[PDB]
Amino acid sequence: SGFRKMAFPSGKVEGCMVQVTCGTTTLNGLWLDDVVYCPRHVICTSEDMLNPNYEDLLIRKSNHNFLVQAGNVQLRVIGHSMQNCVLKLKVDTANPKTPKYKFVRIQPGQTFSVLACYNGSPSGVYQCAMRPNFTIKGSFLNGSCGSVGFNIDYDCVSFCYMHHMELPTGVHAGTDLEGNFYGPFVDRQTAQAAGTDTTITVNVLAWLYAAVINGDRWFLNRFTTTLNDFNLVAMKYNYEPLTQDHVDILGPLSAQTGIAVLDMCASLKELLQNGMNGRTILGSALLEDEFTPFDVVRQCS
Amino acid sequence: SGFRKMAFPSGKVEGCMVQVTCGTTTLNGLWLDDVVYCPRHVICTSEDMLNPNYEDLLIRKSNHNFLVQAGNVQLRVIGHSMQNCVLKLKVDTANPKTPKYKFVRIQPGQTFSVLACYNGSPSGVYQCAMRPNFTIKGSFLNGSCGSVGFNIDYDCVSFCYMHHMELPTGVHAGTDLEGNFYGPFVDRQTAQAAGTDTTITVNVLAWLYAAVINGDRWFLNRFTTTLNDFNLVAMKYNYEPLTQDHVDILGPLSAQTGIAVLDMCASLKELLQNGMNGRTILGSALLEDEFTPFDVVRQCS
Numbered sequence: 001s002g003f004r005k006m007a008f009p010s011g012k013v014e015g016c017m018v019q020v021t022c023g024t025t026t027l028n029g030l031w032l033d034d035v036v037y038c039p040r041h042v043i044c045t046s047e048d049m050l051n052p053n054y055e056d057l058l059i060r061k062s063n064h065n066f067l068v069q070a071g072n073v074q075l076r077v078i079g080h081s082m083q084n085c086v087l088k089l090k091v092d093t094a095n096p097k098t099p100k101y102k103f104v105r106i107q108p109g110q111t112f113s114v115l116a117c118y119n120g121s122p123s124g125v126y127q128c129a130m131r132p133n134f135t136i137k138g139s140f141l142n143g144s145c146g147s148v149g150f151n152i153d154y155d156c157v158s159f160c161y162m163h164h165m166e167l168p169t170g171v172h173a174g175t176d177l178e179g180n181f182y183g184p185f186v187d188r189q190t191a192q193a194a195g196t197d198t199t200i201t202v203n204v205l206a207w208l209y210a211a212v213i214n215g216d217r218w219f220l221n222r223f224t225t226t227l228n229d230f231n232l233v234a235m236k237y238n239y240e241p242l243t244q245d246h247v248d249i250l251g252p253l254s255a256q257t258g259i260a261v262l263d264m265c266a267s268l269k270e271l272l273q274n275g276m277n278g279r280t281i282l283g284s285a286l287l288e289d290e291f292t293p294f295d296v297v298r299q300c301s
Numbered sequence: 302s303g304f305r306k307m308a309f310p311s312g313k314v315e316g317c318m319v320q321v322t323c324g325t326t327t328l329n330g331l332w333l334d335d336v337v338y339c340p341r342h343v344i345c346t347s348e349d350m351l352n353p354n355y356e357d358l359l360i361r362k363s364n365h366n367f368l369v370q371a372g373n374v375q376l377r378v379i380g381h382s383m384q385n386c387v388l389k390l391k392v393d394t395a396n397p398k399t400p401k402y403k404f405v406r407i408q409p410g411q412t413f414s415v416l417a418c419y420n421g422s423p424s425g426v427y428q429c430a431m432r433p434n435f436t437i438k439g440s441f442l443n444g445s446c447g448s449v450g451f452n453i454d455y456d457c458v459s460f461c462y463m464h465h466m467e468l469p470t471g472v473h474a475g476t477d478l479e480g481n482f483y484g485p486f487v488d489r490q491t492a493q494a495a496g497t498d499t500t501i502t503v504n505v506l507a508w509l510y511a512a513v514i515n516g517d518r519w520f521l522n523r524f525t526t527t528l529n530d531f532n533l534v535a536m537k538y539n540y541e542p543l544t545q546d547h548v549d550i551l552g553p554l555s556a557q558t559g560i561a562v563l564d565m566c567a568s569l570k571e572l573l574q575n576g577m578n579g580r581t582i583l584g585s586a587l588l589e590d591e592f593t594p595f596d597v598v599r600q601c602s
């Protein structure tokens with residue numbers, strides 16, 4: 001029993017974190033095989049951050065201008081290229097600790113673990129989700145750039161996020177491992193506003209199923225609803241629309257508990273219209289939306 | 302910016318997790334140097350759990366009855382002993398991945414990271430705290446016994462908890478690495494009730510300081526209080542008493558923000574008497590007490 005924000009064991013990723021310096025700027029890089037991946041803004045200077053021309057800035061950089069350090073060991077750079085907003089530094093040594101890996105561009109609503117790093121050294125690990133507005137609500141400080149997001153399935157690490165920046169809102173924006181930003185964000189010190197952040201409906205429902213499995217059952221009611229009637233309530237409270245694919249993804253949870261998805265939707269509707277009345281569900285006084293149905297079946301069974 | 306329940310990077314501990322089988326029972330063990338540490342209830346059978354006599358059960362066990370497996374590798378047991386509620390299995394090979402470590406018996410209120418394991422394989426990592434009633438609010442399933450709690454300070458891992466059991470409440474009880482249970486709990490399937498779980502006052506205040514550093518300042522008020530006047534409110538809401546040592550431990554946080562500890566105590570008093578009025582602090586609608594002042598300075602600066 002119990003339910004916690006649980007991250008993947010971070011060991012496979014710790015062995016891949018390196019320090020990348022280019023001039024005055026130091027951030028984190030990801031070392032897999034003979035390539036170090038890092039945010040391209042490592043080549044920027046104080047009077048270059050408002051509107052950098054990365055192609056022009058990179059012209060003035062050679063392999064020897066990129067200092068890569070894995071622990072107390074210096075790596076030799078034998079090649080360099082820019083791919084979207086990420087730099088790929090070819091080094092002459094393959095990382096002996098490289099796990100089996102793949103690069104994945106996650107969909108909004110999906111979750112992942114973050115290993116926050118500073119100067120190439122891992123500091124801590126936590127869970128987060130790609131928000132529907134393509135930001136992440138992380139915990140990052142100055143120097144955390146290059147810190148990665150990942151999932152682990154049967155010893156295979158799927159990298160999905162690289163941290164690039166913080167918006168004036170205090171939320172975080174970044175890319176997949178091919179350098180493509182999630183959302184409309186750009187790597188420059190400019191006015192960037194996030195959109196409306198909606199609640200991940202399918203995740204809240206998965207968390208209500210986790211609460212039932214754990215003995216929290218007060219919220220369960222004598223009512224039911226339809227997909228269209230629930231979605232009228234969902235739109236009102238800025239909840240993302242629920243489709244038949246979401247119902248299908250919740251199948252294992254509905255079958256294990258014997259509670260139909262639309263009956264759980266009716267309980268959710270009552271919670272949205274009435275609130276929690278000072279009560280709690282799984283130790284929380286808010287509806288939690290950062291646990292997918294996968295995260296629930298992994299931690300509850 | 303941001304604030305998350307952040308665990309230590311688990312890599313140093315993953316390399317120490319092994320599987321221990323004794324008869325029909327399989328659980329997790331901790332492999333450090335040439336010793337494997339595990340819960341002694343691994344020697345119990347189905348018709349032995351209500352009132353086991355461990356000394357008598359262990360008489361019928363020899364070194365060869367303890368099967369220790371680190372990954373796909375079998376370890377040879379050359380000695381065995383019981384120390385309080387923990388078994389120490391001397392093996393003939395030192396763990397090559399043994400980090401610098403120490404065993405620590407933590408005080409209630411202190412926090413730690415848990416690497417939940419099943420069959421010697423790490424499944425996930427999360428943060429928890431030793432509750433004032435000596436339980437932990439973890440996330441553990443059948444087979445999780447032997448999973449450990451730890452802190453990491455400058456490459457030195459301080460082990461503080463080994464998971465032994467779940468109470469009928471759904472909360473968890475366990476020992477330090479010397480086998481002494483935290484609290485009055487016993488390793489047998491019996492009626493064990495936890496005491497009153499009070500709120501860790503010094504931790505809530507540290508979390509209010511973290512919220513101020515992050516821009517959440519609505520709760521700050523025009524009032525102040527005394528240690529004795531605050532403690533009258535603390536006792537009423539089942540908050541542990543605040544002492545001058547707690548005030549002193551909050552020193553770095555009060556000095557970094559310029560907000561006196563007693564002024565933050567007055568804000569806490571107003572929050573206890575009025576509630577949050579539907580509002581949130583650092584994404585939570587409840588007062589969070591599982592972040593110590595150390596956890597706040599580490600993650601906020």
Ligand SMILES: *[C@](C)(O)C(=O)N(c1ccc(C(C)(C)C)cc1)[C@@H](C(=O)NC(C)(C)C)c1cccnc1
Pocket residue numbers: 027041044049140141142143144145146164165166167187188189302
């Ligand atoms: C990275 C470099 O470690 C970092 O700390 N931040 C950062 C600095 C500068 C950039 C430029 C060169 C402007 C593209 C991007 C990222 C830092 C910021 O995001 N700072 C600004 C852009 C000034 C808000 C950062 C702070 C907190 C959390 N993540 C990143």
Ligand SMILES: *[C@](C)(O)C(=O)N(c1ccc(C(C)(C)C)cc1)[C@@H](C(=O)NC(C)(C)C)c1cccnc1
Pocket residue numbers: 001328342345350441442443444445446447465466467468488489490
């Ligand atoms: C351990 C062995 O992995 C385990 O799953 N639990 C456990 C079983 C049996 C014991 C005895 C032999 C009775 C001392 C202790 C622990 C399991 C329980 O705590 N189960 C009971 C005691 C029947 C409630 C456990 C379940 C969930 C979380 N942690 C432990």
